[PDB]
Amino acid sequence: LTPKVQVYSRFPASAGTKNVLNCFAAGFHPPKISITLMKDGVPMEGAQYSDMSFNDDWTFQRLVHADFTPSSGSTYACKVEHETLKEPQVYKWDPEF
Amino acid sequence: ELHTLRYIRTAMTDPGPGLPWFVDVGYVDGELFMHYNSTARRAVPRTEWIAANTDQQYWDRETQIVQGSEQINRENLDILRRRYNQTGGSHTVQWMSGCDILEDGTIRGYHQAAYDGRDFVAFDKGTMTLTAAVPEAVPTKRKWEEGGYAEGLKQYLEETCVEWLRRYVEYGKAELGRRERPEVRVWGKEADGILTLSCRAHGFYPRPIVVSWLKDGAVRGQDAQSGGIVPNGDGTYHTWVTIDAQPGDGDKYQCRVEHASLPQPGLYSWRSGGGL
Amino acid sequence: TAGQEDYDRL
């Protein structure tokens, strides 16, 4: 029951244009999870944590999204902390991938 | 023609910090329509088709029965804890409720329960009895056959669940019937003599999508690795499909997207490039 | 469209 995380954007990435950064994690137990979006290793403001829901095989899923503006030189990533993981998994977001 | 309804309920011991312990989320054909929180203690509509077609007395009746489940599942979190002889830690009580309307018009009601990610009790309609999965689920079955639970659930799942589901399809006929076109972008990366090509689809409805890579106009199934259909904050969906190729062979590879919104499958290339 | 919260009793 290890969390499977995937980092992605709502709209195709553009410089100086408003976009929503999403971090989805599914298939984990216990339901307690720490999903945080970050810019240059520093957490992002306006995080929307919604909500605790499980799949048909009783495996939990969580979506965390925040409105941001992509900038050149800055790196965007997602940090996930879990009791099963031991080491926190970090997934890097790429505007051209 | 396949219509579904699901009532996801979760009772938690460790939410953990600044998060609710009890949540009740409702669904109509995959789309979210109702939500409940342990600190807010109110059932509120999510979509516009449900709020405009229902009264406030309906939502006041729904929040009163859901807050009743909140107190009942709080007891179950302590009752089951003593059955397994546990003190407390990371224990959760999950609940599955709802019915399915098949294409032909056949009823498919379900009432399932789970403890710590493992199935506890499931209701059988063809036998009119509650099925116990774990030897600790036996006192649960005894309480169910002592009073009235099996008769009432059959009158609820086959009638009450179906009667209202039929109305939700009529209420959200424009919302669920609507189709959204995805924004396809073909990308590439270079690592150690391997040219990794990516295909990203942005904001599509409904959820079913068939994304496959094509080399020289031929489907390469085995080879391409998919991430899965992941949902967005506004209800729409996203998908990520990647493939490994030789450097200098990027142009002969093309991404094929099959969706309900498109009358014919769209072929997208890196240099084309993507949309449109 | 839910019913008896009594069906949650374990």
Author numbering:
A (entry chain B): 2 to 98
B (entry chain A): 1 to 276
C (entry chain C): 1 to 10
Copied sentences from the primary study:
Highly polymorphic class I molecules encoded by the major histocompatibility complex (MHC) are crucial in the adaptive immune response to viruses and some intracellular bacteria, binding peptides inside the cell and presenting them on the cell surface to CD8 T lymphocytes. In contrast, chicken TAP genes are highly polymorphic, with each haplotype encoding a TAP molecule with a peptide-translocation specificity matching the peptide-binding specificity of the dominantly expressed class I molecule encoded by the BF2 gene, with the BF1 gene expressed poorly or not at all. In this paper, we find that two other haplotypes known to confer resistance to Marek's disease also have low cell surface expression and promiscuous peptide motifs, and examine the structural basis for promiscuous binding in three low expressing molecules. Second, we show that peptide-binding repertoire and level of cell surface expression are inversely correlated in both chickens and humans, indicating that this relationship is a fundamental property of class I molecules.
